[PDB]
């Protein structure tokens, strides 16, 4: 709401105006009024009250009040109306302003974008936080100097980057759709202020450069090509087919409509933004870690309290363990079992590990656990993780207090080593007191030069060794056989000893690095020192393989540092945008706030506004989550400070969503028992108001920032049937060439349900599609837009001309009859082809991922024949629990209704040429995803710390291993897939016989 | 007797179960806890020995060549039972000094047989339906408590900020008293002389109105602190209720899993299982 306890104050309200003479003037206000309007009415009435003579003119003063987030905000922008101020209570203090006015407006705008004040970061004691804020500005200034180097073309490249594919080469089936390798393209040109349009139809090669397309248009330096409908430009000199708009038009079979526009006109429209550096920009005895001759021991002093029922629980205790990522470095140690009434221990727990053998990324994972014929169930009450070494390579010492976190929903593990490190900011919380040893004031982890020194010394005692012995053929084949194992396929102890024995030979097959790293004794400084040297000069690998080394099982700084440098060299901005969801979630696994990955992502976010858009929203969506609020908030502060003019565009988006949150909260809470018609009246009445009309019109779509959302078609806006009250919203496309692409932009707003699962599922579908198109299979999937923007707050893209199955049906032949009418004539074959190809990809895609059961409302069909799915509520068969099946179910079962459409009105739909042709497409598609199984496992492994119930552990990710059948042979996996389709179809799915 | 036992009848042999099913059984188990399964049909080797050591699962492949089994060449054991029972009575330090541990605790496939003593299939099938309904009851009960747990945690966080927002307001309203007390002393003292009580009547009326608002705002902040302690007690109360259901959810799941595991044996039809579940 806009006022604490309320949502909106109806115009007639009183406000306590506090003057600098001492008086308190009550004043009648309206909700629409601006500050200079109220300040005119205040100083009008101020003369009645005493001590008027010492008051100055209105122009010298400024309003001040407390906001919803407890900040003393100074309202410089006096055009801001009263309901948009976000006040705590209706009062307004006038004073004379001080300090840097340019900084204070920027800090409030950054604070509004992030969702918390910038002053909250200033009050942080932790030096890691303040070092981050200072040091990260090095990347920010490096980013702006990059995009201002080749100005003003590089200025335009930041704001309007070329949305292109990774590789310029076309697949064969894409190239064959062109006429002798040429596309027919139309370039529109505006005539004058009169606003008439004239087209220039061209016919050119698919690999032409935008400059050469402009050279052909002038027949039919100065100009640049803009996409009609979007705010998307072809500035860079790529092949014309490499752009996603042109590549889509070839597949869809549409005329690409470009707009001729002046280069001087766009360059002048750019902001030419600024980046000001903010205002915050006895001797110690240092001992080395490897000098300490002592085993690790940690004292658990006491736990303050824990929410336990004394009757139901038998005992409580403190479980602890030393962890390198997910792997325990030694045996987990527990405290003595004490009563729930008095949680107190005071005992030195001895861990079987030598302090020098502790690796750089070693972590103390701990929890308070409850206990319940000599059988007992152990359960976690609260959890917490501490990094043994801090961000400056210093080992922890002395006493420290750790406020523990609530256990995540569904986590039955006693410890949570995957979760974030650091104390809970909420102090009204279970607090475990513990004490580490104190040897010196500062115990440091050694430098790389010292590690190399020990590494050479280590291999010397073991019995140029790379080329001393000769690598045999039997050994060379085994290295290939081990590299073919998927990430979660566990290497054996023979294979670990083999991989380590041939660690020097492993450089010849550099994709074996993740297998080689799992073979290292991380509880042994000898082997880690030797691995550090190999990792230093390791041959670089393909970005998709390097993303494995950023998951929770690879916490070492050197291993991660290598992985980030592979992305710097070989990750395209296409594939960065593709995999951005997973790379943002990976930041949760990082030990420290400052790291090589966040610097890489922040630089790419500030040199590419398309990447920076989603980088903002993926971070902003999780700001409610206190496990990552500080990390993500500080990171957003870096972006919002340095991103330039786009912060103003983001605030218009942020303000638009918050107003849609306010109305849907009222509908869910206050209008719960009202009818949907009366709710629509209330909705329309509030949306009609000017503060809502200004906020919810003239801003960029969060689903795609190229899409401009103009005026609301408020009559066509609706509330949906669900109990969470989703809003079916409808905007005009205000672009001058809208009709060629699309006139109206429809988005389903949503406040109750979680859309991270659909966002992931739709990302995976897009990747699955991209694998098939590259391989040769033309299986048209429809990964529609879906972005999560908050705590169960998200947007969904509406597909035009899309109908559910139950709409068409409400007899088995009804679906085939509808599709024949919509595609009546000689274009019937293309519609059945598209339907069959669409069915195949979604039949395979849903089986692998294990999405919720497909009914007629979940399945949808388009006019052209493209089938697609909606509502991926759960996945990886999350409802295997709440039940007891080990079976891999088939969600999308093709009934008689669907088989008739593939078979073209045949009686025996399961025994035709078209169905057998359909079967082969599913088999080729299934094996295509099986061959890229590592990519998907890596992508899911990066999401384990996200907080989704469906992805908490490696047990949950193992569903795709069962459906793809990675432990089995390729042929056995295909025979498995055939049997699963046969069981679901009750014999209808024909066997190889 | 021991070595002459068949590999099928051995308690520690589990057949073609997945590596995930092995990970479930060895989760939070003691050192030397082990079982044997079939090897991956992609990879070389016949069986896989998974055992615990240092809180970690250790996969050791058992190969075969010409009537002999073992971990590496040369293969010296007659059967897999001879290989296992040898390392049940002797350390694996013989094979590899790294993992100095014996095969102490076999994870039996007759483990469920100890718990579910009832022989009849239909009787066990009925208890699975009963245990599943008791599990689903407490599952829906737990979800309802977690819905409250999140909603309560949110509203506490809304209130916690609002308390600080009240305190900033009170600081400003008390700064307004300081603003009055500062500039009123000079003007009231000039007007106490000259016999102008009409001036003091308006100023002291305005001063009382300021203190009246401070009293109300401090009362509103005081009333909010009672709602915070009230709602914080609900958070603690809900967390106690969930931590009592937590262990019941594990046992009801684990027991039902054993009853399902028992019916996985003796080839019970999938149709019957879904009707019971
Ligand atoms: O990614 C998703 C998730 C969910 N689940 C939530 C939900 C549940 C009930 C409900 F009535 C609406 C939404 C729904 C949709 C979803 N999408 C729809 N689409 C309209 C056509 O374009 C694609 C999106 C429609 S049209 C009528 C219902 C509906 N639901 C998409």
Author numbering:
A (entry chain A): 8 to 227, 248 to 308, 320 to 410, 414 to 504, 516 to 862, 873 to 1055
B (entry chain B): 322 to 598
Please give sentences taken from the publication describing this entry.
Phosphatidylinositol 3-kinases (PI3Ks) are lipid kinases that play pivotal roles in a multitude of fundamental biological processes, including proliferation, survival, differentiation, and metabolism. Among the different PI3K subfamily proteins, PI3Kα is the most important isoform in cell proliferation in response to growth factor-tyrosine kinase pathway activation. The gene encoding the p110α subunit, PIK3CA, is mutated at a rate of nearly 30% in human cancers, including colorectal cancer, glioblastoma, and gastric cancer.
Here, we determined the crystal structure of PI3Kα in complex with the potential inhibitor YXY-4F. The crystal structure of PI3Kα–YXY-4F verified that the compound YXY-4F bound to the ATP-binding pocket of the p110α kinase catalytic domain. YXY-4F was anchored by multiple hydrogen bonds and hydrophobic interactions within the pocket formed by residues Ile800, Asp810, Tyr836, Glu849, and Val851 on one side and residues Met922, Ile932, and Asp933 on the other side. The fluorine in the phenyl moiety also accepted a hydrogen bond from the Ser773 hydroxyl group. Additionally, van der Waals interactions from the surrounding hydrophobic residues, including Val850, Ile932, Ile848 and Pro778, significantly contributed to YXY-4F’s affinity. Other interactions, including a divalent sulfur and π system, were also observed between the thienopyrimidine moiety and residue Trp780. Ser773 also moved to accommodate the distance between the phenyl fluorine and the Ser773 hydroxyl group to form a hydrogen bond.
